[PDB]
Design an enzyme around this catalytic site. Structure first.
Site, PDB file in Angstrom:
ATOM      1  CB  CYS A 168      67.091  62.961  43.352  1.00 27.03           C
ATOM      2  SG  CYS A 168      68.638  63.713  43.867  1.00 27.03           S
TER       3      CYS A 168
ATOM      4  CB  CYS B  72      69.371  60.645  40.816  1.00 19.93           C
ATOM      5  SG  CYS B  72      69.559  60.485  42.604  1.00 19.93           S
TER       6      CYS B  72
END
Lengths: 1040, 38, 114, 49
Positions: C37, C40
């Site tokens: 991700c 993140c």
RNA sequence: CCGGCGCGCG
């Protein structure tokens, strides 16, 4: 380095750590269990007990008082007295091992040192063919061992194979093969051509071959070329083994690896010795390759090279250190045995072998060099150099002309631009940004792997050695192309088998995706480098290494994004070693506290480099700021906000101005002078030493006879200049008396400045007198001046030739005068267009309050990518700031400017902007020299050589030719007799010119000719000069 | 010789003179390069 | 001798259950993240900064959704990045924040809600 | 100085027909590579072209 | 006040 740019010192860091782990143990072994001739006393080392203890002196202290940063070695030994049958084991002292700094540099005697990497031919078998006088092809196979031993296998005109060892010593294969015991029967069966070997069997060689020893003796006769029949003995084989087997038959781990490949052998790796099959297998290919089977070995291929880091150089000197220790012990054990004493193991070993051989390795070895500390860029690039020179390497005269060229195996490993200028061109390389040193001494670069559907491929970034580099189809293009077909059939440029192709994407194995993959640090700091000719890229890299840190630094408006990498890896800024909060900040220290651990970080304040450049640090954080481990705390010299800052952003025009920018001259404004834009601090060091003479030791005192109080006005009671005094040319620094003649330390010519540091220090020694050393550091504030050298990052260098008031400079449509004026004729011939891109974008960034960090080769996205970036940012600055002259639709980047002397516009629009210009070390006040007369050489009696020695200028033979071309025979005689070496006539010229009473001809011989006559007399040759009178034909002997 | 080498190729290495159906371009390349370069 | 570069500790579902069950004096901040991700990474840096700020006054932990996917789904995680602010008082209720919220927002939540 | 000749990015004038000629050479290089792959020309003929 | 080695500038 799979996903980020690796640390620029990571190769030095990892190499040294490899030496500590495996280099010490692998070298503390092989240390013989020393036994006396009588075998009574046995001395041995317990290598598993080896230890290193942290250095007692701090790293700052080692350089402060001229010490060496090293750690103690404390292995344990066991001495066996079989007379008493008692063992004594003690922690003996072996020596000091120098420690590498986190920046990758050592400290010896208070001097920073760097160990550079070396390139040399990798061990293995190499196949070459050279034409003879008549053009007949002659093939050759050469064995290269782990120590450079070359065993040449050659095919002669009569197809006879000779194992050549030297230029004359020639030995046949059969004698050499039977020297080790290869029976004549099995030599024939293992080759495809038994007939060829059998055809050369004379009846004399067969008898010697039939027995193992007779082959050895005959091999010795041919190898040594010594008349007579040697006797077979154990010492003869050992004498031969050290000379021949020890130097020409041990391949090593790397040497076995290549031989298993090139000769296609399934031999176990652990076999580090040249097996006899390899020689017989090599002869198969050597004769076999003559008939079109195979290809020749490429000697310039990087797959045939190895790289020796600090790990290999420090481990090798340990091989000399311990071999030097055994000879110390052998003399020591023999000496104590003759006294029938029981010596403690500590007294059998002194620390001189290890300590001295490392002390003298950094001092004398060419690959150990003084760290260049001009600016943060020079500190890191020095450690990443690759050299073919050094011991075991080719010299400039030795170097082949096919070497110094670019080889396709260099791509991603050795920078194709960066090289040294002069005789050593192409022999000193430089590692690429993403290059890595492998586990076989080979250089590796990362490539992105493209694989099929059914493959895990957890990590698709794999480092590729040059040996496997050829056999991959590597593309550098992109996949932004589509037609009515599918994407896999679009064609891109690629590399395969050392050539450039154009194939479809479905046939591509690896992609080169990193932007700075193929360049070194120097070339990776040039914005818009793809618009500069590669010739100027080499020059631009060198000039950035000569930039002087300015008293105030600022970041560049336009950069490449590698400035932050350079700042982090140089160690100039302060980097936190622990997370926490900032509690206190000032000039002298920064206090950081985190997790019950409060630290205090001192800051360098006006320190001196080896290049007389100032070092200074300023805080970059405020009290109450949370810090991560590894984040910046303070900014050093030539560093702003964590980026390399070597120059200034100044307003610049590109136009000719009345000849004051003729050729490469630069016209600047007074604003750069009184604004202190290019002001730099320069600190020199003056040392004086106290020696013990026959008449007595030298004394230091303020009271000096035959001297004025004005000269000694800055001295203290001890006789040394006071801290914070403005010295002058000819002033006194250290007053010293030699019994007593004045031998004081005076300030040289042009050294006027402010004394900032004095160090009265005694070196404690074992004598009744200790050498006293005094170091005086003098700061000099140097503003920019006429004759100084400035340069941009695109190979655009120039000398300042004129400084104008601001009202005389050309000015823009906003009324601002420019700061520099550059000649526009310097672009087309030098072919550096990237400076035009940078100046226009630098102007746009200053108006928009923007900085730009642009990776090179931006045209991989689209055509004219740099043009679209610069033009659109120029228009944005023009529109936002309401400055229509910043972007002109008629001629983008150029604007009409006005003459500051008349107020009338110049006829043509001028390209203006705000580029990044550096100030270089090459400047006046360090090059202006003059001489009337003075000191002469002791032998030649000619004036000395050098500006520092107040020497004169040399009139060489090419200058003598010019004077003979003019016919000026009396100017030539002046520079040959009474301005150089005619001792009698030099003193008369000094007298006549002060009274103005005409100079007569010397008419005698100068001391250089009389010097030649005596030397010819030393060869039993007499050289007489006779004059024959044209009046009465009397022969006159000239005094010589 | 070039009568027993062909027989040995056929017997030991599976050689056979299978027909190569060529395009006009390949046929022209084979027939024209037998004369010379230009 | 060498300090660790990261202060946020990665825990399993079972370890997080044990941590929540046990007595807690300081607020517990649970981070759900995945290495694939993109957002993140920034959340990871922000939480490292937050852990530096709250030395012993808060506990910052992270749970990888590629190892505890079912546990994340049970905890009502609808996406990444997702933070859970768990108060030391069992009577109070935890707070779930979704998105790249500012560091000051985290400070406000910790100070005035835990 | 009075005229003040300079040098801009758009002063570097490529002839108008470069794009026409580069595309023509690209089209001929694309055709030969396909037929070299077909075996209609040999390597030296492709290398020379 | 002598020579080698290394690094540079034009």
């Amino acid at each position: 380095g799979t996903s980020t740019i690796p640390g620029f010192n990571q190769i030095q860091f990892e190499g040294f750590y490899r030496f500590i782990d495996q280099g010490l143990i692998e070298e503390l072994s092989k240390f013989p269990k020393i036994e006396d001739i009588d075998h009574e006393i046995e001395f041995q080392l317990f290598v598993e007990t080896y230890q290193l203890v942290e250095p007692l002196i701090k790293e700052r202290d080692a350089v402060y008082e001229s010490l060496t940063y090293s750690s103690e070695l404390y292995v344990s030994a066991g001495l066996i007295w079989k007379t008493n049958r008692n063992m004594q084991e003690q922690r003996i002292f072996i020596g000091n091992i120098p420690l590498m700094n986190s920046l990758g540099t050592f400290i010896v005697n208070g001097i920073y040192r760097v160990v550079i990497n070396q390139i040399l031919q990798s061990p293995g078998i190499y196949y070459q063919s050279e034409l003879d006088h008549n053009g007949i092809s002659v093939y050759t196979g050469t064995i290269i061992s782990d120590w450079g031993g070359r065993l040449e296998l050659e095919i002669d005109k009569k197809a006879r194979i000779w194992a050549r060892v030297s230029r004359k010593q020639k030995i046949s294969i059969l004698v050499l093969s039977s020297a080790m015991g290869s029976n004549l029967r099995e030599i024939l069966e293992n080759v495809c051509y038994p007939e060829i070997f059998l055809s050369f069997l004379t009846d004399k060689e067969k008898k010697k071959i039939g027995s193992k020893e007779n082959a050895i003796l005959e091999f010795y006769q041919q190898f040594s070329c010594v008349g007579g029949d040697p006797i077979f003995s154990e010492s003869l084989c050992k004498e031969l083994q050290k000379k021949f087997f020890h130097q020409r038959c041990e391949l090593g781990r790397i040497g076995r690896r290549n031989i298993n490949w090139r000769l296609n052998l399934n031999i176990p790796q652990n076999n580090i010795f040249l097996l006899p099959r390899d020689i017989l297998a090599a002869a198969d290919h050597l004769i076999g390759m003559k008939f079109g089977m195979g290809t020749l070995d490429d000697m310039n291929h990087l797959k045939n090279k190895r790289i020796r880091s600090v790990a290999d150089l420090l481990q090798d000197q340990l091989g000399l250190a311990l071999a030097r220790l055994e000879n110390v012990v052998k003399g020591t054990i023999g000496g104590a045995i003759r006294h029938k004493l029981i010596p403690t193991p500590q007294n059998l070993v002194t620390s001189t072998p290890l300590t001295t051989t490392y002390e003298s390795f950094f001092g004398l070895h060419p690959l150990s060099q003084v760290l260049d500390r001009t600016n943060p860029l020079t500190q890191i690039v020095h450690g990443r150099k690759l050299s073919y020179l050094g011991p075991g390497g080719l010299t400039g005269r030795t170097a082949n002309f096919r070497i110094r060229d670019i080889h396709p195996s260099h791509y991603g490993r050795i920078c194709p631009i960066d090289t040294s200028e002069g005789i050593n061109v192409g022999l000193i390389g430089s590692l690429s940004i993403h290059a890595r040193i492998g586990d076989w001494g080979s250089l590796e670069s990362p490539f992105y792997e493209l694989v099929e559907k059914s493959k895990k491929a957890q990590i698709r970034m794999l480092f590729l050695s040059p040996s496997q580099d050829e056999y991959y189809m590597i593309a550098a293009g992109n996949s932004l192309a589509l037609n009515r077909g599918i994407q896999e059939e679009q064609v891109v440029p690629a590399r395969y088998r050392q050539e450039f192709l154009t194939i479809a994407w479905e046939e591509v194995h690896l992609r080169s995706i990193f932007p700075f993959q193929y360049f070194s640090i120097g070339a990776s700091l040039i914005p818009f480098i793809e618009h500069n000719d590669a010739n100027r890229a080499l020059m631009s890299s060198n000039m950035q290494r000569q930039a002087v840190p300015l008293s105030r630094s600022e970041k560049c408006i336009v950069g490449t994004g590698l400035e932050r990498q350079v700042a982090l890896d140089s160690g100039v800024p302060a980097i936190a070693e622990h997370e926490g909060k900032i509690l206190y900040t000032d000039t002298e220290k920064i206090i950081l506290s985190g997790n019950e651990n409060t630290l205090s970080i001192p800051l360098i304040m006006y320190q001196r480099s080896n290049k007389n450049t100032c070092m200074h640090q300023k805080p970059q954080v405020r009290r109450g700021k949370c810090i991560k481990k590894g984040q910046i705390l303070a900014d050093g010299a030539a560093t702003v906000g964590g980026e390399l800052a070597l120059g200034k952003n100044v307003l610049v025009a590109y136009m000719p101005w009345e000849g004051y920018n003729f050729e490469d001259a630069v016209l600047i404004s007074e604003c750069l002078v009184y604004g202190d834009i290019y002001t730099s601090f320069h600190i020199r060091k003056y040392e004086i030493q106290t020696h013990v003479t026959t008449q007595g030791p030298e004394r230091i005192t303020k009271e000096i006879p035959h001297l004025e109080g004005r000269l000694l006005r800055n001295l203290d009671k001890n006789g040394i200049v006071m801290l914070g005094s403005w010295v002058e040319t000819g002033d006194i620094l250290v007053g010293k008396l030699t019994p007593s003649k004045e031998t004081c330390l005076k300030l040289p010519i042009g050294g006027r400045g402010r004394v900032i540091d004095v160090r009265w220090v005694q070196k404690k020694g074992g004598s009744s007198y200790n050498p006293e050393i005094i170091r005086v550091y003098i700061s000099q504030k140097r503003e920019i001046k006429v004759g100084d050298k400035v340069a941009g990052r695109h190979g655009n260098k120039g000398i300042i030739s004129k400084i104008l008031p601001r009202q005389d400079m050309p000015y823009l449509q906003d009324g601002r005068p420019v700061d520099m004026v550059f000649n526009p004729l310097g672009v087309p011939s030098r072919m550096n267009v990237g400076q035009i891109f940078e100046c226009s974008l630098g102007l746009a960034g200053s108006l928009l309050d923007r900085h730009y960090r642009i990776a090179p080769f931006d045209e991989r996205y689209e055509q004219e990518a740099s043009r679209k970036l610069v033009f659109s940012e120029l228009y944005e600055a023009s529109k936002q700031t309401a400055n229509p002259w910043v972007f002109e639709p008629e001629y983008p980047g150029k604007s009409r400017i006005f003459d500051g002397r008349t107020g009338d516009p110049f006829e043509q629009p001028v390209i203006i902007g705000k580029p990044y210009i550096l100030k270089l070390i090459h400047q006046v006040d360090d090059k202006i020299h003059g001489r009337s007369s003075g000191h002469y050489a002791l032998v030649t009696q000619q004036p000395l050589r050098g500006r520092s020695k107040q020497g004169g200028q040399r009139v060489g033979e090419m200058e003598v030719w010019a004077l003979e071309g003019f016919g000026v025979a009396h100017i030539l005689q002046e520079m040959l007799t009474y301005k150089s070496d005619h001792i009698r006539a030099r003193q008369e010229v000094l007298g006549t010119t002060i009274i103005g009473g005409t100079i007569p001809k010397p008419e005698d011989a100068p001391e250089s000719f009389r010097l030649l006559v005596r030397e010819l007399r030393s060869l039993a040759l007499e050289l007489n000069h006779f004059l024959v009178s044209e009046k009465n034909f009397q022969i006159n002997r000239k005094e010589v | 010789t070039e009568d027993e080498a062909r027989r040995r190729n056929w017997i030991e290495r599976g050689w056979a003179p299978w027909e190569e159906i060529l395009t006009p371009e390949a046929d022209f390349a084979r027939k024209s390069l037998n004369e010379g370069e230009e | 001798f060498v300090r660790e570069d990261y202060l946020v500790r990665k825990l399993s579902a079972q370890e997080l259950q044990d941590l929540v069950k046990g007595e807690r004096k300081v607020p517990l901040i649970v981070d759900f993240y995945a290495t694939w991700c993109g957002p993140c990474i920034l959340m990871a840096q922000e939480l490292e900064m937050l852990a530096v700020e709250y030395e012993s006054n808060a506990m910052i932990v992270k749970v990888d959704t590629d190892d505890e996917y079912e546990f994340a789904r049970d905890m009502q995680v609808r996406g990444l990045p997702t933070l859970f602010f768990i108060s030391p008082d069992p009577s109070k209720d935890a707070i779930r924040t979704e998105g790249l919220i500012p560091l000051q927002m985290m400070r406000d939540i910790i100070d005035n809600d835990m | 100085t009075a005229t003040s000749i300079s040098l801009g990015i758009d002063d570097l004038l490529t002839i108008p027909s470069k794009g026409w000629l580069v595309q023509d050479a690209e089209q001929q290089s694309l055709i030969l590579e396909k037929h070299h792959h077909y075996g209609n020309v040999h390597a030296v003929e492709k290398l020379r072209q």
